[PDB]
């Protein structure tokens, strides 16, 4: 069944005004609250 | 088809030791094989 | 909808004037390509 | 527990069971995780008869969620003319501002609910009211490009 969800609205004009990119906004919100797979590393000889 | 009386052995790193510890293990197995010239002959690594 | 695409803010002028997408373009639902045009006994038609 | 069954009854549009919970004295201002009362849910899912029953049993009409939004905010956004009129009859703050400064008129203007916009103005809406960005219901109608609405807001 449907559940409450936190609808955030990015104001384009206000962002364009302050000189903040939308790419940086979305990456910040998405990476922080959602998680972001950056690249691979080696843990005891295995790619992870 | 290779040759007859010839064998193909694979030494495996099963516990994330590393390349150096596996080399030491190979070197240790090769040295032991060399003390049985009556059973084994030409026991050598295939790699570099 | 076409209304939401119409109100896409492209830039903001120094006098606080919003240059929207509908101010520099006509917004409408239209075919991906306009190459194929079919007619059934002369009248407008489509098909598979 | 009983206040929880009221939230699920007010949302699931069960008129009969919502009234049974009143006989048993269910908390009418029973707020969920997000701070929504039964009135919030009925205004949202468009349950008019549940809204009326609730307000009768002393529902707080100016109840606000964890983001400052009232039932009137939800009625005016989802275009529930009747429900909007009931809340305004029962003394809803027509100039109610949420955390972002968005009013019930702001939301009516955005979704282009001309009939509701007229009810709010009738009841004493402030057209010059601003959100946190300094945009009015008139500013909205121009950007959205609504002519019928913009002439009403003048």
Swiss-Prot record, chain A:
Superkingdom field: Bacteria
Secretion signal span: none
Induction: Positively regulated by MarA, Rob and SoxS transcriptional regulators (at protein level).
Localization per record: Cell inner membrane
Consequence of gene disruption: Loss of susceptibility to contact-dependent growth inhibition (CDI); inhibiting cells still contact the target.
Entry's family note: Belongs to the resistance-nodulation-cell division (RND) (TC 2.A.6) family.
Function of the molecule: AcrA-AcrB-AcrZ-TolC is a drug efflux protein complex with broad substrate specificity that uses the proton motive force to export substrates.
Assembly behavior: Homotrimer, with large domains that extend into the periplasm, interacts with AcrA and TolC. AcrA may be required to stably link this protein and TolC. Interacts with AcrZ. Part of the AcrA-AcrB-AcrZ-TolC efflux pump.
Protein name (record): Multidrug efflux pump subunit AcrB
Shown chain mapped onto the complete sequence: 722 to 769 of 1049
């Amino acid at each position: 069944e449907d559940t409450p969800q936190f609808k955030i609205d990015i104001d384009q004009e206000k962002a364009q005004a302050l000189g903040v990119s939308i790419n940086d906004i979305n990456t910040t919100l998405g990476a922080a609250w959602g998680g972001s797979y950056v690249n691979d590393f080696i843990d005891r000889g295995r790619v992870k | 088809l290779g040759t007859a009386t010839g064998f193909d052995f694979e030494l495996i790193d099963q516990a994330g030791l590393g390349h150096e510890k596996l080399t030491q293990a190979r070197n240790q197995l090769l040295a032991e094989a060399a003390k049985h010239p009556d059973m084994l002959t030409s026991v050598r690594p295939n790699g570099l | 909808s076409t209304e939401e695409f119409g109100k896409i803010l492209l830039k903001v002028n120094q006098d606080g004037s919003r240059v929207l997408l509908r101010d520099v373009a006509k917004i409408e639902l239209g075919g991906e390509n306009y190459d194929i045009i079919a007619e059934f006994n002369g009248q407008p038609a489509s098909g598979l | 527990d009983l206040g929880k069954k009221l939230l699920e009854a007010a949302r699931a549009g069960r008129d009969d069971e919502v009234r049974i919970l009143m006989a048993n004295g269910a908390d009418v201002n029973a707020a969920d995780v997000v701070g929504w009362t039964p009135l919030h849910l009925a205004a949202y899912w468009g349950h008019l008869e549940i809204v009326e029953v609730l307000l009768k049993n002393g529902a707080d009409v100016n109840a606000y969620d964890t983001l400052g939004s009232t039932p009137l905010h939800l009625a005016a956004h989802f275009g529930h003319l009747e429900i909007v009129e009931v809340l305004l009859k029962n003394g809803a703050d027509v100039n109610a501002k949420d955390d972002n400064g968005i009013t019930p008129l702001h939301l009516a203007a955005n979704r282009g609910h001309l009939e509701i916009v007229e009810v709010l103005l009738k009841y004493g809406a402030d057209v010059n009211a601003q959100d946190k960005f300094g945009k009015t219901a008139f500013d909205i109608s121009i950007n959205n490009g609504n002519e019928d609405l913009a002439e009403i807001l003048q």
